[PDB]
Structure 1
Amino acid sequence: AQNPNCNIMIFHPTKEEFNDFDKYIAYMESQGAHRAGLAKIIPPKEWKARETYDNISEILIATPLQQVASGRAGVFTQYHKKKKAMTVGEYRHLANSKKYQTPPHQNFEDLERKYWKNRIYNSPIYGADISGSLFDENTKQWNLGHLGTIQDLLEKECGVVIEGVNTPYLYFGMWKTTFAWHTEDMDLYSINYLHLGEPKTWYVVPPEHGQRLERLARELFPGSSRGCGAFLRHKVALISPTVLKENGIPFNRITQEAGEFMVTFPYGYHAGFNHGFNCAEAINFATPRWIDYGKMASQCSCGEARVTFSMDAFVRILQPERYDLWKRGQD
């Protein structure tokens, strides 16, 4: 069995190997990459996402989200308070202000310490989930707006033809902006490219151990667990590495830098934080190996998780027994 310790693997494809996206994902899996839940892919030196970022400040963040924490430093939830619209140029200036900027630090490890010590005492503003792309249309390799769609994968593997679309999303971050512990919708893959700016630190639980994280989360967030049998779908709960280690939960960590891709694999729980002003692009995708994870994915039916249009068909076809309850939670 390849990668039996479930370590995060780092790949350096050549320009030739960067041509065929599906083939390279399958290659990484042949080497056991999926066992970690997360892999890093460093593009060949010849590749670029676009020529420059000199022209992005006019993008609008229609609904910036202030991430307000409750709990203790290592075990907390966050709620998203909506803020007035602002441009990327306005948000960059805000990120760089004395109130929000990254503090002085020695290295990534020192910054990670400071994040976990102090996160809860601040409320950073995240421009998340913005439909759009920063890949140049002429970038042919690993262009996250030109991937094969999940609907087409389901049609190819299963024969069924469904509605829905699959487009990328932009994320503008600042110091301490946080992504809570989650798997993807329908336990899909994700791919994330850090276009520019400061790093993103990731934590991940191997898919084979995801239920260990779920059981800890039920212990640590007991009212949320009574409310919903899949409350991590709400994407609000944070648990620190120290708390994970105290409770014996297997996990790994890695820091993504600008110019790097990360892939999350089906049912790989992940969480993390931004080091300073940055911009990432991410999208969900599927492969044949996903289908069995999609069939078994948990679902939130309590009403909180509310998701895209395109998830309807996935539930309807892969999980027809659950469909009626889940759709009630959507409506």
Structure 2
Amino acid sequence: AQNPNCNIMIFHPTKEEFNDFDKYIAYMESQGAHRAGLAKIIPPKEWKARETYDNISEILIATPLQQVASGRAGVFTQYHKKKKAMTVGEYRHLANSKKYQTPPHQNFEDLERKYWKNRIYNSPIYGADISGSLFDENTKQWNLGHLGTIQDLLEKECGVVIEGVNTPYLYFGMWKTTFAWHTEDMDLYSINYLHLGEPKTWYVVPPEHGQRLERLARELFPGSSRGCGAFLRHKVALISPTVLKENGIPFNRITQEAGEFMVTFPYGYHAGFNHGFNCAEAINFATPRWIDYGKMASQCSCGEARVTFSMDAFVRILQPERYDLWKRGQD
């Protein structure tokens, strides 16, 4: 079995290997990459996402989110307070202000220490889930707006044609902006490209050990667990590396820099934080190997998780027994 310790693997495809996206995911899996739940892909030196980032300031962040924490430094939840709209140029100025900017630090490990010590005492503002793309239309390789759709994959594998669409999302971050512990909708893959700015630190649990994370989360967030049998779908809970280590939970960590892709694999729980002002683009995708994970994915039916239109068909076709209850939680 390849990669039996479930380490995060880093890949350096050549420009020739960068042509066929599906083939390269399958290659990474042949080397055991999925066992980690996360892989890094460094694009060939010849590749670029677009020519420059000099003209993005007028993109609108319609609903910036202030991420307010509750709990203790290593075990906390966050809620999202809606703020008034602002442009990317306004948000960048805000991220660089004395109130929000990255503190002085020695290296990524020192910054990670400071994040876990101090995150809860601040409320950073995140631009999330903004439909759109920063890939140039002429970028033919690994263009996250031109991937094969999840509806076409389900139709190819299973023969059933379904409604729905699959488009990318932009994220504008600042110091301390935080992504809570989660798997993707329907335990899909994700791919994330860091277009510009400061790094993103990731934590990930191997898919084979995801239920160990879920059991710890039920212990640490006991009221939330009584409220919902899949409350990590709410995307509000944080647990630090120190707490994970104290409780014997297998995990790994890595820092993504501008110009790098990350892939999350089906049922790979992940969480992380941004180092400073940045912009990322991400989308979900599927492969034939995903179908069995989609069929077994947990679901929130309490009403909190609320998701896209396109998830309806996935539940309806892959999980017909759960469909009625889940749809009630959607309405």
- Give the TM interval when normalised to the shorter protein: over 0.9
Query: Alpha-carbon deviations, 1:217-238, whole Å to 9, x = none?
Result: 0000000000000000000000
Deviation at 1:181, TM superposition (A): 0.1
Distance 2:245 2:256 in 1: 22
Deviation at 1:31, TM superposition (A): 0.1
Match of 1:10?
10
Deviation at 1:67, TM superposition (A): 0.1
Matches within 5 A, 1:1-331: 1-331=1-331
Distance 1:57 1:104 in 2: 26
Distance 2:254 2:160 in 1: 38
Identity of aligned residues (%): 100
Distance 2:210 2:59 in 1: 37
**Paired residue secondary structure (1:129):** strand
Distance 1:310 1:249 in 2: 33
Deviation at 1:177, TM superposition (A): 0.0
Distance 1:71 1:169 in 2: 30
Kindly report structure 1 stretches of 4+ aligned residues shifted beyond 2 Å.
none
Query: Alpha-carbon deviations, 1:84-143, whole Å to 9, x = none?
Result: 000000000000000000000000000000000000000000000000000000000000
Deviation at 1:17, TM superposition (A): 0.1
RMSD: 0.1
Distance 1:58 1:138 in 2: 22
**Paired residue secondary structure (1:148):** coil
Deviation at 1:169, TM superposition (A): 0.1
Deviation at 1:329, TM superposition (A): 0.1
* Structure 1 residues without counterparts, runs of 5 or longer: none
Distance 1:63 1:203 in 2: 27
Deviation at 1:174, TM superposition (A): 0.0
Distance 2:204 2:126 in 1: 21
Query: Alpha-carbon deviations, 1:40-97, whole Å to 9, x = none?
Result: 0000000000000000000000000000000000000000000000000000000000
Deviation at 1:209, TM superposition (A): 0.1
Distance 1:239 1:5 in 2: 22
Query: Alpha-carbon deviations, 1:140-165, whole Å to 9, x = none?
Result: 00000000000000000000000000
Distance 1:128 1:172 in 2: 6
Distance 2:56 2:100 in 1: 21
**Paired residue secondary structure (2:117):** helix
Distance 1:40 1:158 in 2: 30
Deviation at 1:212, TM superposition (A): 0.1
Distance 2:125 2:11 in 1: 32
Deviation at 1:179, TM superposition (A): 0.1
**Paired residue secondary structure (1:180):** strand
Query: Alpha-carbon deviations, 1:226-254, whole Å to 9, x = none?
Result: 00000000000000000000000000000
Deviation at 1:29, TM superposition (A): 0.1
Distance 1:185 1:116 in 2: 27
Distance 1:68 1:85 in 2: 18
Distance 1:224 1:274 in 2: 26
Query: Alpha-carbon deviations, 1:278-305, whole Å to 9, x = none?
Result: 0000000000000000000000000000
* Structure 2 residues without counterparts, runs of 5 or longer: none
Distance 1:140 1:58 in 2: 25
Matched positions, count: 331
TM-score by length of 1: 1.00
Distance 2:60 2:297 in 1: 34
Distance 2:61 2:34 in 1: 33
**Paired residue secondary structure (1:140):** coil
TM-score by length of 2: 1.00
Distance 1:261 1:25 in 2: 12
